[PDB]
Amino acid sequence: MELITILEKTVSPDRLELEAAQKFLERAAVENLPTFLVELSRVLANPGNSQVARVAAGLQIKNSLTSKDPDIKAQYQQRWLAIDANARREVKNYVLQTLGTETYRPSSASQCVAGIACAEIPVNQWPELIPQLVANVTNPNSTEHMKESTLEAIGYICQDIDPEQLQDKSNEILTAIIQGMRKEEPSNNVKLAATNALLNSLEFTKANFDKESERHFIMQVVCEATQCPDTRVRVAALQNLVKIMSLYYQYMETYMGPALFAITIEAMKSDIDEVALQGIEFWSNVCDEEMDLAIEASEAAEQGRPPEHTSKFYAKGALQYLVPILTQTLTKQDENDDDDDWNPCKAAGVCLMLLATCCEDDIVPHVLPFIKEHIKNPDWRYRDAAVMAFGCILEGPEPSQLKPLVIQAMPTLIELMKDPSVVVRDTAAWTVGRICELLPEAAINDVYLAPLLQCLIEGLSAEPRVASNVCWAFSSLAEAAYEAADVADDQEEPATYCLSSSFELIVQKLLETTDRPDGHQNNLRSSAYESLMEIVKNSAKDCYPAVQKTTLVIMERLQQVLQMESHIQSTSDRIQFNDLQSLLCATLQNVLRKVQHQDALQISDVVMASLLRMFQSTAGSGGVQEDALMAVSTLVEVLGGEFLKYMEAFKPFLGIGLKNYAEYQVCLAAVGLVGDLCRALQSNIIPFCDEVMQLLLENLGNENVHRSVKPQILSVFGDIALAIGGEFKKYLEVVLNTLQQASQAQVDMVDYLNELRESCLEAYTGIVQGLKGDQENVHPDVMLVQPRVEFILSFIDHIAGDEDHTDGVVACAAGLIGDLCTAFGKDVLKLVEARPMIHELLTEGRRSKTNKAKTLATWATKELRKLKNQA
Amino acid sequence: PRLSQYKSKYEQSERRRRLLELQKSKRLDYVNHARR
């Protein structure tokens, strides 16, 4: 029928009827998209159409130009740009004129205007957009909707467009935003839209802020909006101050004292939770930023050079005034507790905890009073806060100032574990655990240990919000006791730690608490096993016989339930069985890594035997086909080479996992196993490489899917390489294909860009080190990659450019530089010195963030040295 | 925003993240020993 009738039906509840329209419009966009969008835009522009139709039409245009999937989003944009320059010209003039003619609140034009902009802006294909949008907001005769919707467009633009290509007009974008935000603006709806619009645009106003005149004008309009009689705006503007402080910290000194200080604390001191939440954040962010600077200042000094950015210690100054606002807000506990609800009460504890790490000592004399004053308050709210606050400040004052107070705090803490209110007891175990975690010497004491250990054992039977916390308190205690025993006993494991006489009592309680039916509440099950692993790992050698017994119990459970899973009744049953499986599978990874190696083999020969029996019955599909390949992976560790025996019977299941590409998740964990199979059987995985490498190349040969995967199959190609040596020749061919194309990859798919670049790098190393030698005869397969050295260095050269550099990538790229020199032998020097950016990437690596990013980077220049004295 | 931090202790994100980091170090070990 008529596009108008088909649209009013896309929103028809009748399932069959809805599909009809969704397939009519669907196919209409296949046959002739240009015509479609012109007619759909006309329908949106005509005010005379029904609200439903109009909105249905704009949602259609929106989903022809954008999506959540970046690869798909980047595809709808290319399809749009390839259309007739005039068809697009009509679509734009309807979509753009629609602004202001919509009585419905959320405009559809905006998200279209937005959708089209992200595609046309980069290429200067829509020169109407900015001056027409700015014109609609600054014209004095513009209606409420007109200003509102237009700012709603700019709000989406900055948020959806490539962060880079917009700085040119940052001048225009900003003049329209701050105009909407002006106190004299009659509508609060407009103000909020604009204030929210500025929030997503500050990311490129760097050129504007570098100018006193404007920066100052922006700051005023922002602070003035923190006084608006519409909470929605108040917060939005307060959100800006938070952002403005994280991007333009270098500036804030001028405004801080005379304005920001008054505004920030008034919100914290508010009665409105929304506003309160934003003011507390403001300061914990300052605390985070002035910390990230103390690191810069500490590293630059270790080089003597001036730190590019300087701290102005604002927290240190605000400390006096913040503490009482925080400690008092701790008092607003949420009786009806929810470990999923974020509120000022919880927010206030984090800020105190952060204020303690940032300023250190100074904090102590400001919190102690409240503590000793409320520690025994008849009303728990002030009693809990007196204990919460105590904990938050345990990190980041001198260990030689808290120990005496802590010791002098133990007995009262011990008692608080017998408190009438759940909340007080919940926070008490956390404090005890933090005391055990940061200042062990007070827990592992010949005075309070016995009564403390007794406190925690009973605590395991308390309520889930207490029981869950006690476990961490135990594990933190056990790690310490172990460390306090193996300071230096000449051997690897200690003789006996002061939990040796109670170990057997300790372990069985955690074995019970694991099955407490109310285990889902407050993450008890998970925490309970997590504690058992940590307490078994950290244990005295004379507790072994007790660890054996515990290990026999965990195996027994991965049976009671691992034949459960070959008899599933429901998807609820399906789900919990796997949740138990996983918890036993992970508690398995540490008991094996603990018992005698001789013993750890017989346990593994049993579990793998059972996993082999479970795989055959559920090869088709599988609830039991994800966390099981993860259980297999560790059984493939506590046998190493010995796993060869299993390989043939397990091979096809490595594969059905590999073939299952629709559930990329299984597949991901499957592809990882292959790597582990490669390192356990160096040179016995040869009779399996070839199916696997096949099942893997097919996985990449066609698109679709989804694309976390690609980077891990690539990385594994390297593992295979190393393991099968001159058998890689067969595939090296197509391998450098995917590699070649995947390096040229371009785009928070960042973070994914880095992850993919690291995979390629890791693969290149695997192939090179794989086809070169140890005790060889001569060498020379590697040189089959010789023609790529150029690209490899040139792909690494481009990595040196991107201001991203995840220190993991610098490592694998640095390490690869080393490999090429060791293979490729002084022709590489001329190619590396041709790219100055490579020298800079190695120097950046020689500075340690993460460790042995330095070691791989210190070793690549090392190899690139004594080339210089050879020929 | 920071709910992860309140009562900081220390599921699907970890075990996975935590497994690769191990599968990664084992790689560094397997490669490094073969480098030198």
Side-chain angles (χ1 to χ4, degrees):
Chain A
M1 280 187 294
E2 182 70 61
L3 231 299
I4 298 304
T5 322
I6 59 190
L7 289 170
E8 299 184 310
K9 305 291 105 65
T10 46
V11 197
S12 182
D14 190 286
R15 182 90 173 286
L16 168 60
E17 159 68 356
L18 162 147
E19 304 265 301
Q22 268 294 308
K23 293 291 292 178
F24 169 88
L25 294 185
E26 189 181 306
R27 70 138 156 76
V30 175
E31 295 175 7
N32 202 175
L33 190 72
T35 308
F36 194 56
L37 303 163
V38 165
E39 206 167 1
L40 280 175
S41 57
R42 281 189 64 100
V43 177
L44 176 60
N46 174 1
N49 285 305
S50 65
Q51 212 170 75
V52 178
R54 262 183 139 201
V55 172
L59 181 62
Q60 278 293 321
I61 297 284
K62 193 189 80 184
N63 292 309
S64 294
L65 284 136
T66 185
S67 63
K68 284 81 264 180
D69 192 312
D71 301 304
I72 294 164
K73 172 190 179 180
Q75 187 183 300
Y76 288 173
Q77 294 179 332
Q78 300 296 317
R79 183 181 64 197
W80 163 265
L81 286 164
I83 300 166
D84 169 44
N86 280 49
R88 293 189 275 106
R89 190 159 294 185
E90 292 180 56
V91 182
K92 283 179 287 172
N93 297 346
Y94 281 117
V95 167
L96 193 61
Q97 293 178 359
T98 300
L99 298 166
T101 54
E102 279 177 288
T103 303
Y104 179 57
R105 287 292 297 179
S107 167
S108 291
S110 303
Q111 293 192 291
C112 301
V113 163
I116 298 166
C118 295
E120 284 193 41
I121 290 30
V123 283
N124 294 299
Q125 203 72 54
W126 200 2
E128 298 72 284
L129 182 72
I130 184 171
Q132 175 77 73
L133 290 193
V134 163
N136 286 328
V137 177
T138 67
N139 163 286
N141 294 168
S142 300
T143 56
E144 184 182 297
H145 294 310
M146 165 91 268
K147 287 190 276 188
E148 178 161 44
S149 61
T150 306
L151 287 166
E152 272 180 352
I154 312 168
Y156 280 120
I157 303 161
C158 314
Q159 181 193 292
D160 289 319
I161 199 101
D162 184 295
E164 187 75 295
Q165 301 157 311
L166 234 192
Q167 306 183 314
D168 306 291
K169 317 164 190 65
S170 66
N171 208 68
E172 253 68 46
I173 290 65
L174 257 182
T175 24
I177 298 299
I178 59 190
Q179 177 76 160
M181 274 190 300
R182 78 187 205 261
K183 188 184 180 183
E184 298 74 46
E185 171 71 52
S187 168
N188 296 309
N189 290 315
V190 172
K191 281 167 168 180
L192 167 77
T195 313
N196 267 330
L198 177 85
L199 185 53
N200 302 306
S201 69
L202 290 153
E203 278 284 355
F204 51 69
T205 54
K206 299 175 183 294
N208 292 283
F209 267 72
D210 285 5
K211 296 170 181 62
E212 180 164 32
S213 187
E214 291 184 10
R215 179 214 313 148
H216 155 65
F217 167 53
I218 307 298
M219 285 303 293
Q220 195 188 313
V221 170
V222 165
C223 286
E224 219 159 77
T226 66
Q227 305 294 296
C228 181
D230 191 299
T231 304
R232 280 184 304 164
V233 193
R234 252 251 273 195
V235 182
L238 272 166
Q239 274 183 296
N240 283 105
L241 296 183
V242 185
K243 198 172 181 68
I244 292 165
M245 173 70 73
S246 292
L247 304 171
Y248 307 117
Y249 179 98
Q250 281 191 306
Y251 287 103
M252 278 296 98
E253 193 184 350
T254 306
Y255 312 91
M256 168 56 89
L260 300 178
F261 203 68
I263 278 74
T264 53
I265 312 162
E266 214 65 31
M268 300 179 79
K269 273 183 171 172
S270 182
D271 64 298
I272 305 83
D273 283 4
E274 194 68 295
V275 181
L277 270 174
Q278 220 65 57
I280 295 161
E281 174 67 59
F282 181 104
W283 283 101
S284 50
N285 177 50
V286 174
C287 273
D288 257 344
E289 279 301 299
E290 280 178 351
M291 261 202 286
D292 285 333
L293 290 166
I295 271 166
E296 199 176 315
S298 180
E299 286 185 5
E302 285 185 303
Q303 305 185 65
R305 162 171 40 181
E308 301 173 312
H309 289 90
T310 303
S311 186
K312 310 298 287 187
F313 315 83
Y314 289 129
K316 193 186 181 73
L319 200 85
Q320 314 172 215
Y321 310 79
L322 294 173
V323 186
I325 311 298
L326 298 172
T327 56
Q328 163 72 24
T329 306
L330 300 182
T331 292
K332 292 191 174 185
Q333 280 82 357
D334 215 45
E335 185 69 70
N336 168 54
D337 183 59
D338 204 296
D339 54 68
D340 205 287
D341 178 69
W342 179 251
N343 61 281
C345 170
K346 296 183 180 179
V350 181
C351 184
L352 225 182
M353 193 158 79
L354 281 162
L355 254 176
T357 55
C358 170
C359 305
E360 298 187 58
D361 310 284
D362 323 29
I363 59 190
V364 167
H366 285 79
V367 186
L368 266 179
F370 173 95
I371 306 299
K372 273 283 173 287
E373 206 156 10
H374 284 291
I375 197 296
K376 254 196 166 189
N377 198 127
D379 176 49
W380 66 269
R381 313 176 78 86
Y382 290 84
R383 181 150 25 75
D384 186 64
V387 183
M388 178 74 76
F390 178 53
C392 306
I393 67 94
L394 283 165
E395 195 156 32
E398 280 180 295
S400 61
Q401 186 190 167
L402 281 54
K403 287 182 194 299
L405 297 161
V406 170
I407 281 165
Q408 94 183 193
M410 291 296 285
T412 302
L413 253 295
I414 293 167
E415 297 186 336
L416 287 154
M417 283 252 74
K418 301 184 188 65
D419 192 292
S421 187
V422 194
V423 187
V424 191
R425 256 161 39 242
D426 162 309
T427 316
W430 173 75
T431 311
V432 163
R434 200 145 150 96
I435 295 167
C436 297
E437 182 192 39
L438 300 156
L439 308 168
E441 296 164 49
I444 300 79
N445 190 311
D446 310 301
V447 167
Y448 302 118
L449 193 81
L452 173 58
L453 276 166
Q454 197 213 174
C455 275
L456 303 166
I457 299 161
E458 297 183 15
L460 293 159
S461 302
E463 299 89 343
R465 58 193 291 190
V466 185
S468 180
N469 288 9
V470 176
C471 291
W472 172 73
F474 243 123
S475 65
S476 286
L477 173 63
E479 291 188 34
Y482 174 90
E483 278 190 53
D486 86 307
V487 180
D489 299 355
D490 288 305
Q491 268 69 58
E492 50 200 353
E493 186 174 46
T496 168
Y497 73 160
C498 298
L499 314 174
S500 300
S501 181
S502 308
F503 195 76
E504 180 56 56
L505 174 60
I506 304 308
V507 299
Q508 91 152 69
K509 230 61 195 179
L510 286 169
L511 277 170
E512 288 186 4
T513 299
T514 45
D515 264 297
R516 290 180 52 166
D518 52 332
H520 178 56
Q521 287 168 181
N522 295 273
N523 204 58
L524 230 194
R525 248 205 313 169
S526 295
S527 293
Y529 277 100
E530 168 71 53
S531 65
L532 231 186
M533 311 189 286
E534 216 77 49
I535 206 294
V536 162
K537 156 93 163 292
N538 287 288
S539 68
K541 72 190 185 194
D542 61 333
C543 295
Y544 185 60
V547 168
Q548 289 193 79
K549 193 178 293 177
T550 305
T551 306
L552 298 181
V553 177
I554 304 168
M555 283 200 284
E556 181 181 343
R557 292 193 203 170
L558 198 50
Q559 175 270 156
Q560 197 177 304
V561 198
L562 196 169
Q563 61 87 254
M564 298 219 234
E565 295 182 305
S566 68
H567 301 103
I568 283 165
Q569 275 184 60
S570 65
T571 174
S572 156
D573 277 326
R574 198 139 24 217
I575 294 300
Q576 219 46 273
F577 284 161
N578 279 157
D579 291 3
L580 223 156
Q581 183 181 75
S582 308
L583 293 169
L584 288 169
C585 290
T587 302
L588 191 73
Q589 306 179 303
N590 301 295
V591 288
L592 294 159
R593 201 184 301 182
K594 185 62 186 178
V595 291
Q596 311 165 59
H597 181 285
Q598 305 152 312
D599 275 29
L601 292 166
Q602 268 76 51
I603 279 72
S604 302
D605 282 315
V606 171
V607 185
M608 175 54 66
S610 294
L611 280 169
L612 286 177
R613 183 173 60 79
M614 188 273 290
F615 282 156
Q616 191 179 56
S617 306
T618 49
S621 295
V624 259
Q625 252 277 300
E626 202 295 65
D627 300 296
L629 292 173
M630 287 181 70
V632 168
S633 299
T634 24
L635 259 21
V636 178
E637 247 66 353
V638 201
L639 286 151
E642 297 194 28
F643 189 93
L644 180 56
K645 195 271 180 179
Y646 297 103
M647 250 303 257
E648 169 78 45
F650 171 59
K651 166 221 296 171
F653 293 118
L654 223 219
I656 175 79
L658 278 163
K659 201 161 318 195
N660 165 310
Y661 79 90
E663 283 202 71
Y664 61 90
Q665 276 314 44
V666 189
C667 170
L668 207 71
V671 171
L673 228 165
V674 189
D676 279 304
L677 273 180
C678 289
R679 275 169 259 120
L681 343 143
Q682 339 132 181
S683 182
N684 302 112
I685 214 301
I686 267 296
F688 311 94
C689 329
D690 297 308
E691 15 184 325
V692 171
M693 188 50 54
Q694 163 177 287
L695 292 164
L696 288 177
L697 277 166
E698 156 193 308
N699 198 313
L700 297 180
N702 253 58
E703 67 135 30
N704 293 252
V705 220
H706 178 161
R707 118 190 206 272
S708 332
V709 160
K710 195 192 177 84
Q712 305 295 182
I713 276 162
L714 288 165
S715 280
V716 156
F717 281 158
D719 285 336
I720 273 70
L722 283 155
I724 60 183
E727 203 80 30
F728 207 75
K729 303 173 184 176
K730 310 156 57 180
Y731 319 94
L732 177 60
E733 169 190 321
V734 197
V735 168
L736 302 158
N737 271 80
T738 319
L739 282 182
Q740 187 71 42
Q741 189 190 52
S743 299
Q744 289 187 307
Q746 167 94 33
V747 293
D748 119 82
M749 342 62 209
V750 24
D751 236 23
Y752 165 92
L753 175 71
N754 299 153
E755 201 168 294
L756 177 60
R757 290 183 173 192
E758 189 183 307
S759 293
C760 298
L761 297 163
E762 282 192 313
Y764 276 119
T765 296
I767 268 74
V768 176
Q769 287 290 300
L771 301 150
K772 173 222 177 205
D774 219 34
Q775 212 197 167
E776 226 131 352
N777 320 232
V778 71
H779 264 246
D781 281 354
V782 278
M783 314 259 293
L784 280 162
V785 164
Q786 183 273 304
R788 317 313 197 96
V789 184
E790 166 58 52
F791 174 68
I792 323 314
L793 294 167
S794 298
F795 163 62
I796 60 170
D797 179 38
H798 192 60
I799 284 162
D802 292 56
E803 271 290 310
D804 302 308
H805 284 178
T806 167
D807 276 289
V809 166
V810 180
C812 294
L816 196 266
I817 289 165
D819 302 308
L820 295 179
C821 307
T822 312
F824 284 137
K826 182 208 172 47
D827 302 287
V828 182
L829 188 67
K830 279 187 180 181
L831 296 169
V832 169
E833 282 191 305
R835 295 80 182 284
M837 290 301 276
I838 298 298
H839 293 302
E840 285 194 62
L841 171 65
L842 294 174
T843 310
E844 184 187 302
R846 275 181 289 166
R847 310 201 301 260
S848 155
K849 239 168 185 187
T850 2
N851 336 262
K852 355 279 190 184
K854 73 210 179 186
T855 64
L856 290 170
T858 196
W859 169 57
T861 310
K862 181 143 174 125
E863 286 288 314
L864 276 177
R865 192 68 165 110
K866 182 70 176 179
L867 301 161
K868 285 184 197 287
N869 312 292
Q870 180 192 48
Chain B
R2 297 185 193 256
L3 190 57
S4 341
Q5 320 198 244
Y6 170 72
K7 281 178 184 165
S8 56
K9 312 274 165 62
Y10 203 170
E11 92 285 45
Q12 350 152 290
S13 59
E14 278 293 343
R15 46 168 89 156
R16 292 194 197 114
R17 166 219 189 103
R18 192 209 280 240
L19 183 65
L20 320 176
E21 79 152 62
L22 187 65
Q23 293 180 350
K24 243 162 194 172
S25 56
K26 305 287 262 299
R27 214 186 301 269
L28 195 55
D29 289 14
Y30 192 73
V31 183
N32 286 17
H33 133 306
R35 306 210 215 209
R36 309 91 182 255

